[PDB]
Swiss-Prot record, chain B:
Protein name as it appears in the record: Transient receptor potential cation channel subfamily M member 4
Motif Selectivity filter: positions: 124-126
Disulfide cross-links: 142-160
Entry PTM: Phosphorylation by PKC leads to increase the sensitivity to Ca(2+).
Gene Ontology biological-process annotations: adaptive immune response; calcium ion transport; calcium-mediated signaling; cellular response to ATP; dendritic cell chemotaxis; inorganic cation transmembrane transport; membrane depolarization during AV node cell action potential; membrane depolarization during bundle of His cell action potential
Part of the whole protein covered: 848 to 1162 of 1213
Gene Ontology, cellular component aspect: endoplasmic reticulum; Golgi apparatus; membrane; neuronal cell body; nucleoplasm; plasma membrane; sodium channel complex
Sequence segments annotated as region (Mediates modulation by decavanadate and PIP2-binding): 267-272
Entry's transmembrane regions: 13-33, 36-59, 80-100, 169-189
Knockout or disruption consequences: Mice have fewer dendritic cells in lymphoid organs and impaired migration of dendritic cells is seen.
Binding site for Ca(2+) 2: 14, 17
Oligomer and partners: Homotetramer.
Length: 516, 294, 85
């Protein structure tokens, strides 16, 4: 209580050695080092001078390093007791947990520890054992009375609410019910989609999309700052986009003049709900970090499309210009200029559309010169024979540049970017993994089709409106490990070669003073 | 003998070597019955694949092929990421294309062929354009339904397909080849290169450690080929029914003790002549000189 | 490096200045003719070249705002593009 007030004082005035000394003498040390890192980074953004901003950011990195090292020793002694050390409402920092202080401070070196990631796996599995294999969970999910057997080790009516209360089973029920939504959407769209009246299964589909809209609205309300934090994201713009195209699709479908337009919009809406799946599986240990890396390859893809489109316009117009096809509609010309050279990259090389030796000649044109007739309804009806060896030679150059330079240089750029980015992507994933687990923890505890009864429960509820000595034994244990850590750091600093050279130089200075 | 059988069943290739013979017994058993002849021939063909893949485990003793065969199994997490991202993209593309085009032959295996199987082969360069592009097709009134219709070429592409908004089917074709054949395949080469250079050292250490166990298990075998091992199992079965010198060792161990003493002396002389230890002795000598002046 | 870490506006006026001791050539022109490639690789010099690129406009203007103001010439006189760098 004195040392805490002096610690806040020294952080507020940017005094470095003062704040480190006041940290070393106080108690509740992991939470106060994360709160120190939070307070200094909030100040360092709100700064005018560049030197004082860099000074606060360096001192905040010192406090983040000390909380990492202290929790390292507290974890290597006892894992159960360090687990009770993090998950504890610290009354000196607004009764916020240490994981919440590390989350708001963007302390990504704290989350990268193997101890914190092990405690997030145990928080993930809930009451179950964190070494339960996934097949046992699937068998216990599709056999609900198989919970009461010797399959799933418990303790890391009651047994029932310990299975169905874990965040893993809320994840797994969310995935299964979303796959049944897509299976229903595909049955409506590919089998029974009637031109006059919506069938029974299509009305069931409309009800399901109403419950997904109410779940988004539940996470949109729970007010302008909240809605702008929601609209600021990317996948929440997408989750808004899938339902806006659903409303446009069903709205055009019910009118008696726009039936084909509504069916087309609903097919493109199926693609958006399916790509939502990729965001659901970012919580998984195996698939998750790889899904995160995929979005960081798009600057290399955009370079590929720039260089390709320059080369595709040049090749396509020169070939369509030397050959002179007589069918010259505008979509026919755009097909032969842009679309036929694009498919030659993927091995689709039509030689009988652009090589006269594979073609039958004749007087198919009332115009001066030689002419020949290609095979195909869309390759032109009559094409020129003049300087055809140059069309074949442009074919050879196009396959050389596109299929050898561009594709193999793109593999070289993906390999360089992947090895450069892979470390920072794993740190970013480990930091966000707490937020993903925490948002499956706070959900309506039913599948989306059945969440409407929990929104009714929430709507009527809206219309109606560690012990003390266990904490002391915990904090004294933490203070023991803090004192051992600081003593071992001081003994390692004193026995270094540079400090011993300093003490040797002072002793020789004393010997010169004795001889003086 | 229960602990031995559970150490045997714990492995992976011994489960496979059990699996090839169980499918052999199912295959010959169904083959000899007079009603299940085609089922027995089918099971024996799939049994041929398991005996052939057993070969890969035999050649792990070789110096050249061995460590590379060991690395192949550690690439499967990258392959499983590829199949996850592919199946999400293949369902989205396949259902949207099968939904915009409206083929009239709507059997369930015909729909599953056009949704899952035709977009899978477009990754390997098999792009059927005359099944999904109306400009390559002959139009007509093939459907008694409102709208324009056209007739694709093929016994399995549907008999009559819709012409409405066909440029979107071509544009989905362009996007599918872009994502699948450029993003996914080249990112998979990037992940194989990263994983290979990361794993290659620990795989060579694991192979060098197991190489003694593989040599030792070819040392203790019946000393005949498998076709002819039955006479050695008869020899073993009747045998079951019936039931360095001293001073060369001393000269060896004294030679070992000589090299141990040279090793410890050279380690001590290298520790004493380091710069940090010499700074310790210099600091103690100056401490003595302050005590002489004191 | 030190003159940039104190003040960016004042270091910007330090480079863009006709030095009368070296023939009234700018410091970027002396670094250009000397092929001093370690001088141009600094984050400070590359930030000043981005501000020289964007001219009077803000150097954090997105490209879509520039395209809309290019194909709508009276849309310059609005609250889209921050001026005075």
């Amino acid at each position: 209580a004195p040392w805490s007030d002096l610690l806040i004082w020294a952080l507020l005035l940017n005094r470095a050695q003062m704040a480190i000394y006041f940290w070393e003498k106080g108690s509740n040390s992991v939470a106060s080092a994360l709160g120190a890192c939070l307070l200094l980074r909030v100040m360092a953004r709100l700064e005018s001078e560049a030197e004082e901003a860099a000074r606060r950011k360096d001192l905040a990195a010192t406090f983040e390093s000390m909380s990492v090292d202290l929790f390292g020793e507290c974890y290597h002694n006892s894992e159960e007791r360090a687990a009770r050390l993090l998950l504890r409402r610290c009354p000196l920092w607004g009764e916020a947990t240490c994981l919440q202080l590390a989350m708001q401070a963007d302390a990504r070196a704290f989350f990268a520890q193997d101890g914190v990631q092990s405690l997030l796996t145990q928080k993930w599995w809930g009451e179950m054992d964190s070494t339960t294999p996934i097949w046992a969970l699937l068998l216990a999910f599709f056999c609900p009375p198989l919970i009461y057997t010797n399959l799933i080790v418990f303790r890391k009516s009651k047994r029932w609410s310990d299975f169905w209360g874990a965040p893993v089973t809320a994840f797994l029920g969310n995935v299964v019910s979303y796959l049944l939504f897509l299976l229903l959407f595909a049955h409506v769209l590919l089998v029974d989609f009637q031109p006059t009246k919506p069938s029974v299964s299509e009305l069931l589909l409309y009800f399901w999309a109403f419950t997904l809209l109410c779940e988004e609205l539940r996470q949109g309300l729970g007010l302008r700052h909240r809605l702008h934090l929601y609209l600021s994201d990317t996948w929440n713009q997408c989750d808004l986009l899938a339902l806006t195209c659903f409303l446009l699709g069903v709205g055009c479908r019910l009118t008696p003049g726009l039936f084909d337009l509504g069916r087309t919009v609903l097919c493109l809406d199926f693609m958006i709900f399916t790509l939502r799946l990729l965001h659901i599986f970012t919580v998984n240990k195996q698939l998750g970090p790889k899904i995160v890396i995929v979005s960081k390859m798009m600057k290399d893809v955009f370079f590929f499309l720039f260089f390709l489109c320059v080369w595709l316009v040049a090749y396509g117009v020169a070939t369509e210009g030397i050959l002179r096809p007589q069918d010259r509609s505008l979509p026919s010309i755009l097909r032969r200029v842009f679309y036929r050279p694009y498919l030659q990259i993927f091995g689709q090389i039509p030689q009988e559309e652009m090589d006269v030796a594979l073609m039958i000649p004749g007087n198919c044109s009332m115009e001066r010169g030689s002419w020949a007739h290609p095979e195909g309804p869309v390759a032109g009806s009559c094409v020129s024979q003049y300087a055809n060896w140059l069309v074949v030679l442009l074919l050879i150059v196009f396959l050389l540049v596109a299929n050898i330079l561009l594709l193999n240089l793109l593999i070289a750029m993906f390999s360089y970017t992947f090895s450069k980015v892979h470390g920072n992507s794993d740190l970013y994933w480990k930091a966000q993994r707490y937020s993903l687990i925490r948002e499956f923890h706070s959900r309506p505890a039913l599948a989306p089709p059945l969440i409407i009864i929990s929104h009714v429960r929430l709507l009527i509820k809206w219309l109606r409106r560690l012990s003390k000595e266990a904490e002391r034994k915990l904090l004294t244990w933490e203070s023991v490990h803090k004192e051992n850590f600081l003593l071992a750091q001081a003994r390692d600093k004193r026995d270094s070669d540079s400090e011993r050279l300093k003490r040797t130089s002072q002793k020789v200075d004393t010997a010169l003073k004795q001889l003086g």
